[PDB]
Design a protein around this ligand. Structure first.
Ligand code: TKU
Length: 297
């Protein structure tokens, strides 16, 4: 419950759009150098979405143990990140679960704005549902994402029924869910825990079209008043993350809507930890993912 010691060390030791994207990529590949991912067979590809081609990467496990494709949406505040920044997480998800994983390079803001990545993420999920029989898998997919990518996975899940899209589960890793309400964790951990109040504002300015967008349910899936019938859900939070309370409240709300829900707070942890392989909690959370999906298919 105190701040993990390795996290403390991490936090102690630490301007242009293109080069802000760059330092994000460099921070990521620096973590991967320090703690290399397992080897995994991949193949690049493209998906035709209603907003353009979107690059994807398919991960193939050494040993296929799971009978649904995972579709992973990377985080980074809708502004940063890509297939490469999240390779360390996706590689381990692929090998630990023994699932084929579709990692998605959706359109980043501010070039694309809300709700372009929502539509594209829906299109890729539909693509994967269509391909699944030909991979030898069940047609129902698992959607998954971290932070901003958890937001997308949550919106995709809520829109699944309307869009005739089969989803077997949703893995939300410290997701952003509510852009309207100021929770206690948002106030208590506003500064100093990697993800900051000022950054969250800036991401919002880049992603949304106008301030009114914050209350739209495809920006804020938490405001959706009827969560009955949604995909079984694994919701992971970090204790010391401003996003913690919305994530946890959402899992509570799903539980009360009859949705089979597993809720896990990682104590001592901060936002982003599932892409930070310097922390052993990253692999623990990946084992949590593998255990949860055993209870699915
Ligand atoms: C090896 C991979 C490198 C990246 C890794 C750190 C080394 C993880 O970083 C993060 O998770 C992260 C860090 C800073 C800013 C944003 C994020 C992020 O994903 O979500 C931002 C949230 C803001 C609330 C979107 C909500 C918009 C209202």
């Amino acid at each position: 419950m105190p701040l993990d010691p390795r996290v403390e060390q991490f936090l102690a030791q630490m301007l242009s759009l293109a080069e802000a994207r760059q330092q994000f990529k460099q921070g990521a590949l620096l973590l991967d150098q320090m703690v290399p991912p397992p080897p995994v067979d991949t193949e690049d590809g493209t998906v035709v979405t209603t907003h353009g081609p979107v690059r994807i990467r398919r991960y193939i496990p050494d040993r296929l143990r799971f009978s649904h494709p995972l579709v992973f949406y990377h985080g980074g505040g809708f502004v940063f990140g890509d297939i490469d920044t999240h390779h360390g997480l996706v590689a381990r998800l692929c090998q630990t679960v023994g699932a084929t994983v579709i990692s998605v390079d959706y359109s980043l803001a501010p070039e694309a704005k809300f709700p372009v990545p929502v539509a594209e993420c829906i299109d890729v999920a539909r693509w994967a549902a269509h391909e699944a029989p030909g991979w030898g898998l069940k047609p129902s997919i698992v959607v998954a994402g971290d932070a901003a990518g958890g937001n997308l996975a949550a919106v995709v899940s809520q829109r699944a029924k309307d869009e005739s899209l089969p989803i077997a589960a949703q893995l939300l890793f410290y997701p952003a869910l509510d852009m309207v309400h100021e929770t206690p964790s948002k106030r208590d951990f506003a500064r100093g825990y990697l993800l900051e109040a000022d950054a969250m504002q800036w991401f919002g300015e880049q992603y949304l079209r106008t301030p009114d967008d914050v209350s739209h349910p495809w920006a804020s899936p938490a405001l959706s008043p009827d969560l009955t019938g949604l995909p079984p859900a694994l919701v992971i939070t970090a204790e010391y993350d401003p996003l913690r309370d919305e994530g946890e409240a959402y899992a509570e709300a799903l539980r009360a809507a009859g949705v089979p829900t597993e809720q896990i707070r990682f104590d001592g942890m901060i936002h982003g930890f599932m892409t930070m392989p310097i922390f052993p909690q990253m692999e623990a959370a990946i084992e949590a993912v593998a255990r949860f999906l055993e209870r699915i298919d």
